[PDB]
C-alpha cells in the first residue's frame, strides 16, 4: 500500500499498466456523432449559466423533464417568452401532482408529450430512464406515441406503471453491447433533497449493470459526476480544456468499499490502496496532474467527481 | 424470514411487541443539545443560507463554535449587514491552512481575539482538523492551558504548524477513557450540497466518528435535511406529533458506503422486513415518510445514514 505526491504536471507512462477502458471527459457533455443522446432535467431549480444551457440543449437530441422539472424549466426561462417557447422538452413524465396548472397548460398547449405514472414504487428518475430507453429502443413504443387517437388517453400507456411494464418487456431481449449507446446528461439530480442525491448515485451503478448502453453523467453547479469502470480506465482530456475548466477530483466508493489497485496522473497517486466511505479512506480534494490523461484502476466500479468551472465550459463545447 | 414491504395507512401506532430497542433518540435533540452534554456548532466552507432567526437560536443552543478555514469568510459575509450582530456571533476557533481566508476577514477575527490555528498538512481535511480540535478543546485540559497560558508566546499558539492538532489529538486519545468522556452534540452547517467529493467526505465523518470517537454525536443541517447516523440493531426515533407535522417531511434510509440488511422497520409509510439495501443494487428506501404517531423504529444489521426532510422556516418555534 502506497501514496505519493506528484509534481504539478507530468506525462504518465504506459509501461506496466493494462488500459482496458478509455473515456474522454468532453464526451460526457458533447455526445458522440452516432450514439443516441438525451438531456434529462430532474426536479430541482436550474441555475446552470444560460449560455451553457443553450449549448448542452443543442448537443443533445431528446429532452426529458421529470415531473416537477417542467416547472423548473418554465421558471428558468423567465426573461423572454420567445426563448421559453424555443426550448420545449420532448417528454414530461411523472405523477404530475407537482405541476402547476399554469405550467401543465403551457406545455400541453405547446404539444409536449405528457405521460402520467401514478406508481409510488419507482422514482421519477426511473420513470424517465425507462421512457428514454423505450423511445430509442422500442419501435412499438414509438408507434404508440406518434399515433393519433391516443394522446387523449395517456397515449395508450397504463396509468399506474405502464412505462415500467413496457420497459421490462422490452429489456428482456436486449443485449446491451449491441444496443446503440445513449449519452445521458442529467441536471438537478444532485444537491437537493439528500435521499434524492443518493438515489441519483444509485442510477450510475444500476444502469451500468442493468442497462449498460446508457452513459450517464450528472452536471451540477460544481461537478461532473459519473461512473468509472473497474480494471483500468484511462481518463482523457485536452490540456487546455483541463487547465481552464477543471479543478479538483475525487474517487468515491459510494455504497461499496473497494480497492484502488493503481492510479497514474493524480496529484496524489495510490497503489494497492483500500478505499471505503465507512473507514474514511477516500481520495477527496485530489486533482489531475497528467497533462492530457489520468489512469485509474480499481477492483470494482467507482464513482468519480470532477470539479468544473461552468462559466468557462462553453468555450470548449 | 421472507423479504417483505408493506404500505401503511398515513398514521399507525407501533408497539414493543417482541423487538429489541438498542437506542432511543428524539429528532429535536439533534438540534437542541441536552443540558448535561457538551455542544458545538461547526461551520464548514460553503455559503450559509440558513434563516437568520433559526441561526440565532442554534447558535445560542450550542456552546463552542468552530469555523473550518474558509468558513470564516462565509460567516463574515453571512452577517454583512449588522456589525452589532457580527460582533455578537464571533466563532471560538478558526482552523485550517488559512490560504482561502480573506485578508480582510483574517484581520477582523484576529483583532476580535478569535483563536486562529494554522495547519498546513494536505493529508487531512479541514473537517478532521476541526473535530480533532473540538475534542481537544473539551477533553484535554492541557490543550486549553496551551492556548490560554499567557507565558506562551510561541507562534500559532504553540501548535506545530504541519499536523500539531492531530499529533496532540492522537496523544490525548491514548489516555482517554471513552466510556467516561462527556458526549459532544455536534451540529454542522455547509458540509452537504457543494463540491461533491466534500459531500462524500462529510458522510464518512458520520461513520468514522461513530467508530473512532463515539462520544461525538454528529448531525448535518442543510436547507432541506437533517442527516445523521442510525446505529445498528434497533433504533427508536421519537418525535412530538405537532413538531413532526409542522417541521418534518419525508425521510430516507441510506446505506452509503456499505450495503446492509434492513431487518425491520415499524412506523414508516413503507415498512420493510428482511429487506436487503444497497446503493449498488439500487435497493434504497427513498421518499419514505414517518407514519408512526409519535415514533419510528428502524433495525438494521449495520449502521446506516438517515436523512429527515425538514421545513427550516418552521423549526424555530419548536427549538
Ligand atoms: C421500501 C420503500 N421505501 C420508500 C418507498 C416510496 N417511494 C419510492 S419511489 C417514490 C416516488 C418518488 O421517488 C416513493 C414515494 C417505497 N415505495 N418503498
Ligand atoms: C489519496 C489522497 N487523495 C487526496 C489527497 C489530498 N487532500 C486530502 S485532505 C486535503 C485538503 C482538503 O481537504 C487534500 C488536498 C491526499 N493527500 N491523498
XYZ file of C-alpha atoms and ligand atoms in Angstrom:
672
model
C 0.000 0.000 0.000
C 1.376 3.386 -1.017
C 0.563 7.025 -1.733
C 2.839 9.527 -3.469
C 2.557 13.269 -4.035
C 3.474 14.014 -7.655
C 4.777 17.138 -9.427
C 2.031 19.537 -10.507
C 2.301 18.375 -14.118
C 3.574 15.161 -15.667
C 3.162 12.888 -18.663
C 2.249 9.452 -17.349
C 3.996 6.410 -18.743
C 2.070 3.424 -20.067
C 4.597 0.787 -19.057
C 3.312 -1.857 -16.640
C -0.353 -0.856 -16.959
C -3.318 -2.533 -18.617
C -5.659 0.015 -20.198
C -8.950 -1.859 -20.549
C -11.209 1.172 -20.984
C -10.788 4.691 -22.337
C -13.073 7.670 -21.846
C -12.956 11.365 -22.721
C -14.315 13.935 -20.257
C -15.629 16.211 -23.001
C -17.717 13.356 -24.419
C -19.619 13.286 -21.119
C -21.188 16.571 -22.225
C -20.770 16.511 -26.013
C -22.382 13.292 -27.360
C -20.612 11.136 -29.949
C -21.655 11.577 -33.598
C -23.850 8.497 -33.965
C -24.847 7.436 -30.474
C -28.238 8.485 -29.146
C -28.383 11.317 -26.631
C -30.700 12.842 -24.066
C -30.704 15.827 -21.745
C -32.592 14.880 -18.591
C -33.935 17.611 -16.330
C -34.784 16.498 -12.798
C -36.945 18.400 -10.309
C -34.567 20.969 -8.817
C -34.058 24.663 -9.537
C -31.953 25.183 -12.654
C -29.011 27.544 -12.194
C -26.556 26.487 -14.892
C -25.359 29.510 -16.910
C -27.783 30.349 -19.723
C -25.121 30.160 -22.479
C -24.062 26.697 -21.312
C -27.701 25.621 -21.129
C -28.302 26.583 -24.761
C -25.186 24.680 -25.758
C -25.904 21.399 -23.983
C -29.502 21.605 -25.197
C -28.286 21.752 -28.803
C -25.755 18.979 -28.211
C -28.486 16.559 -27.160
C -31.294 15.033 -29.190
C -34.065 14.127 -26.750
C -35.014 16.375 -23.822
C -36.969 14.927 -20.903
C -38.460 16.653 -17.866
C -39.027 14.696 -14.672
C -42.438 15.750 -13.345
C -41.880 18.992 -11.445
C -38.812 19.646 -13.592
C -41.305 21.153 -16.034
C -41.961 23.916 -13.502
C -38.206 24.368 -13.163
C -37.683 24.763 -16.916
C -40.639 27.137 -17.243
C -39.373 29.427 -14.463
C -35.745 29.159 -15.593
C -36.637 30.715 -18.953
C -38.474 33.692 -17.446
C -36.696 36.604 -19.153
C -38.034 36.236 -22.699
C -41.185 34.470 -23.883
C -39.653 33.665 -27.279
C -36.836 31.754 -25.591
C -39.181 29.795 -23.331
C -41.076 28.511 -26.378
C -37.795 27.749 -28.159
C -36.784 25.167 -25.556
C -39.662 22.720 -25.242
C -38.987 19.261 -23.773
C -39.965 16.212 -25.822
C -41.472 14.475 -22.792
C -42.740 15.267 -19.303
C -43.336 12.204 -17.135
C -44.355 11.599 -13.523
C -47.424 11.612 -11.268
C -47.887 15.217 -12.414
C -49.072 16.360 -8.977
C -46.071 18.693 -8.717
C -47.016 20.518 -11.925
C -48.751 23.870 -11.605
C -51.873 24.220 -13.746
C -50.095 27.135 -15.420
C -47.089 25.039 -16.460
C -49.137 21.971 -17.420
C -51.338 24.103 -19.677
C -48.338 25.829 -21.277
C -46.515 22.666 -22.333
C -49.729 20.853 -23.221
C -50.690 23.764 -25.467
C -47.217 23.562 -26.994
C -47.687 19.870 -27.850
C -45.260 18.355 -25.333
C -45.829 14.623 -24.840
C -47.034 14.427 -21.240
C -47.223 10.990 -19.623
C -48.797 10.289 -16.239
C -47.499 7.487 -13.996
C -49.053 7.132 -10.540
C -46.901 4.337 -9.083
C -45.137 5.301 -5.858
C -42.756 2.355 -6.160
C -40.467 3.952 -8.723
C -38.676 7.293 -8.666
C -39.271 9.915 -11.334
C -35.708 9.189 -12.426
C -36.540 5.538 -13.112
C -39.741 6.603 -14.861
C -37.585 8.844 -17.059
C -34.848 6.326 -17.909
C -37.436 3.660 -18.731
C -39.159 6.159 -21.034
C -35.915 7.246 -22.697
C -34.905 3.653 -23.429
C -38.329 2.806 -24.865
C -38.167 5.927 -27.032
C -34.938 4.809 -28.705
C -35.123 1.025 -28.477
C -38.801 0.143 -28.913
C -40.253 0.645 -32.413
C -43.607 -0.414 -30.993
C -43.457 2.292 -28.317
C -42.557 4.955 -30.877
C -45.563 3.960 -32.984
C -47.693 4.161 -29.844
C -46.556 7.704 -29.030
C -46.752 9.008 -32.600
C -50.276 7.744 -33.206
C -53.386 9.917 -33.227
C -56.355 8.781 -31.118
C -54.136 8.078 -28.104
C -52.948 11.386 -26.636
C -56.343 11.836 -25.001
C -55.943 8.634 -23.013
C -52.400 8.928 -21.630
C -51.009 7.922 -25.030
C -52.119 4.322 -24.515
C -49.803 3.833 -21.545
C -51.169 2.075 -18.445
C -51.625 4.835 -15.845
C -50.050 3.121 -12.823
C -46.775 1.668 -14.110
C -47.136 1.152 -17.856
C -43.756 2.716 -18.631
C -42.117 0.143 -16.360
C -44.154 -2.776 -17.697
C -43.309 -1.851 -21.293
C -39.665 -1.230 -20.374
C -39.398 -4.606 -18.633
C -40.934 -6.482 -21.564
C -38.509 -4.794 -23.964
C -35.351 -5.176 -21.869
C -35.938 -8.932 -21.621
C -34.447 -9.351 -25.103
C -31.918 -6.509 -25.298
C -28.203 -7.303 -25.482
C -26.629 -4.120 -24.103
C -23.353 -4.435 -26.037
C -25.459 -4.422 -29.210
C -27.720 -1.518 -28.264
C -26.834 1.933 -29.586
C -25.355 3.917 -26.673
C -27.387 6.704 -25.104
C -25.328 9.678 -23.946
C -27.346 10.895 -20.967
C -26.570 14.208 -19.254
C -28.663 14.965 -16.170
C -29.414 18.286 -14.485
C -30.767 18.705 -10.953
C -30.119 15.235 -9.567
C -27.537 16.403 -7.031
C -27.592 18.984 -4.240
C -31.232 18.947 -3.145
C -33.294 16.566 -1.002
C -30.491 14.281 0.158
C -32.237 10.948 -0.351
C -32.659 12.070 -3.962
C -28.934 12.745 -4.277
C -28.304 9.193 -3.094
C -30.873 7.755 -5.487
C -29.231 9.586 -8.381
C -25.953 7.941 -7.425
C -27.592 4.502 -7.429
C -28.608 5.134 -11.048
C -24.937 5.281 -12.014
C -24.470 1.741 -10.679
C -27.769 0.130 -11.724
C -27.726 1.483 -15.282
C -24.150 0.289 -15.765
C -25.294 -3.204 -14.751
C -28.900 -3.497 -15.974
C -28.896 -1.059 -18.922
C -25.232 -0.736 -19.876
C -25.966 1.114 -23.126
C -26.690 4.200 -21.024
C -23.799 6.577 -20.384
C -24.977 8.779 -17.529
C -23.229 11.874 -16.230
C -24.556 14.466 -13.816
C -23.723 18.115 -14.359
C -24.016 20.275 -11.269
C -23.023 23.872 -10.486
C -19.661 22.469 -9.365
C -19.185 18.914 -10.644
C -19.436 16.298 -13.341
C -20.352 13.036 -11.628
C -20.069 9.724 -13.445
C -19.006 6.107 -13.046
C -15.594 4.672 -13.903
C -15.293 1.008 -14.838
C -13.033 -1.350 -12.910
C -9.758 -2.935 -14.042
C -8.067 0.012 -15.742
C -9.660 3.160 -17.124
C -7.804 5.967 -18.871
C -9.456 9.362 -18.470
C -8.520 11.613 -21.385
C -8.821 15.370 -21.814
C -7.419 18.207 -23.901
C -4.695 20.012 -21.895
C -6.218 23.474 -22.337
C -9.705 22.195 -21.531
C -8.381 20.699 -18.293
C -6.295 23.711 -17.270
C -9.136 26.186 -17.849
C -12.308 24.281 -16.937
C -11.251 21.581 -14.465
C -10.471 21.821 -10.765
C -10.126 19.042 -8.187
C -11.448 15.480 -8.404
C -12.405 12.611 -6.135
C -12.511 8.818 -6.257
C -15.744 7.913 -4.471
C -16.554 4.301 -3.481
C -20.157 5.202 -2.710
C -22.248 2.390 -1.270
C -19.469 -0.189 -1.515
C -15.845 -0.470 -0.404
C -13.228 -1.427 -2.984
C -9.518 -1.409 -3.768
C -7.673 1.166 -5.845
C -5.122 -1.120 -7.475
C -3.227 1.784 -9.033
C -3.578 5.355 -10.290
C -1.327 7.417 -12.549
C -1.789 11.103 -13.271
C -3.230 12.281 -9.956
C -1.560 14.813 -7.658
C -1.732 12.037 -5.079
C -1.336 8.627 -6.723
C -2.079 5.438 -4.801
C -1.409 1.722 -5.252
C -2.931 -1.323 -3.516
C -4.895 1.335 -1.645
C -8.109 0.181 0.093
C -10.912 2.741 -0.129
C -14.198 2.964 1.760
C -16.694 5.577 2.924
C -17.033 3.636 6.175
C -13.319 3.723 7.018
C -12.993 7.292 5.798
C -10.273 6.205 3.391
C -11.461 8.263 0.433
C -9.365 10.269 -2.001
C -11.018 13.686 -1.818
C -9.550 17.020 -2.895
C -7.273 15.205 -5.329
C -6.573 16.645 -8.781
C -5.284 15.643 -12.213
C -1.583 16.241 -12.877
C -1.379 14.170 -16.045
C -1.025 16.563 -18.980
C -3.732 15.004 -21.171
C -4.806 11.879 -19.287
C -5.043 10.091 -15.946
C -5.182 6.358 -15.226
C -7.385 4.780 -12.560
C -7.503 1.036 -11.904
C -9.995 -0.126 -9.267
C -11.126 -3.637 -8.292
C -14.767 -2.564 -8.591
C -16.565 0.232 -10.434
C -16.302 3.536 -8.589
C -17.831 6.985 -8.851
C -15.704 9.944 -9.868
C -16.485 13.608 -9.409
C -14.599 16.191 -11.434
C -14.866 19.799 -10.343
C -15.776 22.123 -13.187
C -15.799 25.869 -13.712
C -19.120 26.158 -15.547
C -18.547 29.745 -16.703
C -15.549 28.514 -18.742
C -17.130 25.376 -20.220
C -18.968 26.986 -23.158
C -15.702 27.839 -24.933
C -14.719 24.169 -25.286
C -18.041 22.675 -26.387
C -37.576 -14.669 7.087
C -39.057 -13.751 3.720
C -38.428 -10.288 2.320
C -41.434 -8.033 2.806
C -42.592 -4.483 2.176
C -45.979 -3.149 3.220
C -47.680 0.171 2.570
C -49.157 1.554 5.782
C -52.053 3.981 6.110
C -50.952 7.551 6.899
C -50.939 7.043 10.684
C -50.331 3.998 12.889
C -49.041 3.107 16.349
C -46.103 0.763 16.650
C -45.593 -1.437 19.637
C -42.827 -3.044 21.772
C -44.313 -6.343 20.599
C -41.188 -8.513 20.716
C -38.458 -6.428 19.107
C -35.468 -5.063 20.988
C -34.670 -1.361 21.193
C -30.966 -0.741 21.428
C -31.089 3.041 21.147
C -33.705 5.811 21.593
C -33.407 9.345 20.252
C -35.615 12.396 19.721
C -35.226 14.378 16.490
C -35.187 17.694 18.362
C -32.133 16.611 20.349
C -30.123 16.632 17.117
C -30.503 20.416 17.118
C -31.116 21.193 20.793
C -28.263 19.649 22.865
C -29.085 18.110 26.245
C -28.152 20.047 29.385
C -25.549 17.524 30.596
C -23.564 17.192 27.358
C -21.053 19.417 25.581
C -22.081 21.014 22.296
C -20.574 22.578 19.199
C -21.812 24.332 16.082
C -19.441 23.565 13.220
C -19.454 25.818 10.173
C -17.861 24.363 7.053
C -16.675 26.247 3.962
C -19.895 26.738 1.997
C -22.215 29.714 1.579
C -24.527 29.974 4.586
C -28.211 30.092 3.625
C -29.986 29.106 6.844
C -32.687 31.561 8.007
C -31.434 34.168 10.482
C -33.956 33.580 13.287
C -33.012 29.895 13.225
C -29.286 30.657 13.064
C -29.518 32.871 16.153
C -31.289 30.079 18.027
C -28.958 27.250 17.017
C -26.008 29.472 17.893
C -27.445 30.158 21.348
C -28.193 26.447 21.805
C -24.570 25.437 21.261
C -21.521 26.196 23.390
C -18.488 26.078 21.094
C -18.475 27.500 17.561
C -15.807 26.451 15.079
C -15.103 27.716 11.567
C -13.304 25.476 9.087
C -10.810 27.711 7.270
C -12.807 29.447 4.539
C -15.932 29.107 6.677
C -14.739 32.284 8.396
C -15.351 34.189 5.161
C -18.779 32.572 4.896
C -19.755 33.669 8.407
C -18.253 37.126 7.908
C -20.309 37.723 4.758
C -23.405 35.959 6.090
C -23.642 38.808 8.591
C -22.751 41.515 6.062
C -25.307 43.895 7.497
C -25.334 44.494 11.285
C -21.918 44.919 12.909
C -23.566 44.538 16.310
C -24.685 41.023 15.413
C -21.443 40.164 13.625
C -19.532 41.015 16.803
C -22.141 39.078 18.766
C -21.504 35.961 16.693
C -17.733 35.540 16.805
C -16.507 31.944 16.424
C -14.327 30.450 19.160
C -11.858 28.923 16.698
C -10.839 29.156 13.046
C -8.635 26.305 11.853
C -7.157 25.176 8.545
C -4.279 26.077 6.218
C -5.825 29.564 6.050
C -4.878 30.344 2.438
C -8.504 30.793 1.348
C -9.003 33.132 4.302
C -9.729 36.693 3.176
C -7.037 39.111 4.336
C -9.871 41.379 5.466
C -11.654 38.525 7.244
C -8.451 37.307 8.913
C -7.671 40.745 10.335
C -11.226 41.205 11.620
C -11.375 37.962 13.597
C -7.799 38.179 14.815
C -8.429 41.685 16.127
C -11.531 40.358 17.892
C -9.431 37.718 19.666
C -10.701 34.635 17.835
C -8.293 31.743 18.368
C -6.947 31.136 14.869
C -4.947 27.948 14.315
C -2.955 27.204 11.171
C -2.446 23.609 9.997
C -0.725 23.040 6.645
C -0.998 19.262 6.225
C -2.706 18.278 2.983
C -3.283 14.742 4.250
C -6.290 15.584 6.398
C -9.449 17.554 5.637
C -10.418 20.760 7.407
C -13.273 18.708 8.855
C -10.861 16.276 10.521
C -8.764 19.218 11.711
C -11.914 20.656 13.289
C -13.178 17.549 15.089
C -9.691 16.833 16.443
C -9.612 20.427 17.690
C -13.111 20.168 19.150
C -12.251 17.022 21.110
C -9.035 18.593 22.412
C -10.960 21.699 23.466
C -13.380 19.692 25.604
C -11.251 16.722 26.649
C -7.680 17.991 27.030
C -7.176 20.452 29.913
C -3.538 20.688 28.820
C -4.542 21.825 25.340
C -6.723 24.534 26.865
C -3.766 25.603 29.001
C -1.510 25.686 25.941
C -3.770 28.147 24.128
C -4.663 30.115 27.273
C -1.393 30.485 29.192
C -0.032 33.999 28.729
C 3.587 32.887 29.102
C 3.046 31.041 25.811
C 4.434 33.481 23.256
C 5.064 30.804 20.626
C 3.511 31.397 17.211
C 0.337 29.536 16.246
C -0.490 29.204 19.945
C 2.319 26.684 20.378
C 0.719 24.208 17.984
C 3.041 22.511 15.485
C 2.233 24.017 12.069
C 2.021 20.898 9.889
C -0.126 18.492 11.911
C 0.119 19.588 15.538
C -3.611 19.327 16.228
C -3.637 15.718 15.035
C -0.484 14.835 16.970
C -1.944 16.355 20.140
C -5.282 14.657 19.458
C -3.666 11.242 18.981
C -1.661 11.605 22.191
C -4.741 12.611 24.183
C -6.832 9.775 22.755
C -4.263 7.309 24.112
C -5.053 8.210 27.733
C -8.725 8.962 27.153
C -11.319 6.699 28.785
C -14.004 6.843 26.085
C -16.738 5.331 28.268
C -16.312 8.320 30.593
C -15.999 11.087 28.002
C -18.780 13.672 28.141
C -20.824 13.461 24.914
C -20.409 16.216 22.331
C -23.537 17.217 20.425
C -22.177 18.399 17.075
C -24.338 20.257 14.547
C -22.681 21.026 11.209
C -23.544 23.634 8.585
C -22.294 23.680 4.996
C -20.968 20.132 4.726
C -23.569 18.986 2.201
C -24.618 20.292 -1.211
C -21.430 21.835 -2.572
C -18.371 20.204 -4.122
C -19.452 16.579 -4.325
C -16.284 14.939 -3.011
C -16.730 17.067 0.083
C -20.314 15.934 0.497
C -18.982 12.382 0.447
C -16.254 13.207 2.959
C -18.891 14.731 5.225
C -20.668 11.380 5.093
C -17.518 9.436 6.000
C -17.308 11.505 9.199
C -20.617 10.048 10.389
C -19.128 6.558 10.097
C -15.582 7.286 11.306
C -16.560 9.372 14.339
C -19.068 6.696 15.329
C -16.231 4.170 15.214
C -13.192 6.103 16.467
C -14.707 8.923 18.554
C -18.089 7.582 19.652
C -18.566 10.394 22.169
C -19.384 12.645 19.208
C -22.995 12.909 18.051
C -22.810 14.452 14.592
C -25.737 15.755 12.566
C -25.811 17.841 9.405
C -28.377 20.563 8.894
C -28.875 21.616 5.294
C -31.517 23.782 3.608
C -33.634 20.638 3.241
C -32.375 17.901 5.562
C -31.066 16.690 8.876
C -28.517 13.986 8.106
C -27.237 11.653 10.794
C -26.230 8.084 11.583
C -28.571 5.358 12.801
C -26.888 2.688 14.930
C -27.453 -0.960 14.013
C -29.666 -3.485 15.814
C -32.655 -1.269 16.565
C -33.025 2.487 16.964
C -36.237 4.198 18.029
C -36.728 7.663 16.553
C -39.046 9.781 18.693
C -40.921 12.967 17.842
C -43.735 15.148 19.129
C -46.700 14.852 16.726
C -47.125 18.618 16.347
C -43.400 19.002 15.678
C -43.386 16.177 13.141
C -46.472 17.514 11.339
C -45.191 21.091 11.227
C -41.474 20.659 10.513
C -40.926 17.164 9.095
C -41.321 15.909 5.547
C -40.061 12.679 4.009
C -37.068 10.572 5.039
C -34.666 8.051 3.579
C -32.643 5.053 4.718
C -29.257 5.457 3.040
C -26.650 2.646 3.061
C -23.922 4.999 1.851
C -20.526 3.317 1.738
C -21.661 -0.216 2.527
C -24.642 -2.453 1.788
C -26.588 -3.931 4.683
C -29.857 -5.551 5.704
C -32.923 -3.741 6.994
C -34.080 -6.369 9.469
C -37.263 -4.467 10.256
C -38.905 -1.056 10.406
C -42.124 -0.025 12.129
C -43.692 3.376 11.593
C -42.678 4.173 8.014
C -45.226 4.669 5.218
C -43.424 1.726 3.642
C -42.219 -0.693 6.324
C -39.827 -3.498 5.427
C -38.524 -6.772 6.891
C -35.514 -8.915 5.913
C -35.031 -6.236 3.256
C -31.537 -6.060 1.695
C -30.425 -2.496 0.922
C -27.569 -1.231 -1.250
C -26.662 1.821 -3.324
C -25.112 -0.520 -5.893
C -28.225 -2.658 -6.402
C -30.446 0.409 -6.314
C -32.435 -1.014 -3.415
C -32.666 2.132 -1.301
C -35.710 3.396 0.580
C -36.048 6.954 -0.709
C -39.048 9.263 -0.425
C -40.313 7.317 2.579
C -42.034 9.101 5.465
C -42.958 8.666 9.126
C -46.467 7.345 9.804
C -45.986 6.372 13.425
C -47.975 8.749 15.632
C -45.005 9.598 17.845
C -42.150 7.284 16.862
C -40.497 5.154 14.187
C -38.394 2.021 14.689
C -35.523 1.091 12.378
C -33.487 -2.086 12.842
C -30.510 -2.551 10.526
C -27.695 -5.119 10.544
C -25.076 -2.379 10.196
C -25.129 1.372 10.837
C -26.858 3.386 8.124
C -27.348 7.054 7.287
C -30.784 8.608 7.688
C -31.917 11.866 6.158
C -35.006 13.573 7.522
C -36.513 16.301 5.390
C -37.091 19.456 7.400
C -39.046 22.640 6.800
C -36.363 25.026 8.043
C -38.604 28.092 8.385
C -40.800 26.170 10.853
C -38.087 24.871 13.201
C -37.540 27.970 15.360
C -40.917 27.600 17.103
C -40.034 24.154 18.470
C -36.427 24.841 19.478
C -39.167 0.396 0.770
C -39.777 1.628 0.165
N -39.351 2.905 0.574
C -39.919 4.063 0.008
C -40.924 3.955 -0.971
C -41.525 5.204 -1.578
N -41.204 5.738 -2.932
C -40.336 5.167 -3.645
S -40.055 5.920 -5.246
C -41.316 7.081 -4.686
C -41.781 8.252 -5.548
C -40.726 9.388 -5.502
O -39.426 8.846 -5.757
C -41.765 6.781 -3.438
C -42.833 7.599 -2.728
C -41.353 2.671 -1.381
N -42.357 2.535 -2.361
N -40.781 1.514 -0.810
C -5.050 9.587 -1.622
C -5.123 11.077 -1.437
N -6.097 11.827 -2.119
C -6.174 13.225 -1.949
C -5.273 13.884 -1.093
C -5.366 15.386 -0.908
N -6.037 16.018 0.266
C -6.528 15.303 1.180
S -7.301 16.203 2.519
C -6.805 17.642 1.550
C -7.102 19.068 1.997
C -8.583 19.398 1.688
O -9.432 18.534 2.445
C -6.159 17.289 0.410
C -5.630 18.311 -0.589
C -4.291 13.129 -0.409
N -3.379 13.765 0.456
N -4.220 11.731 -0.583
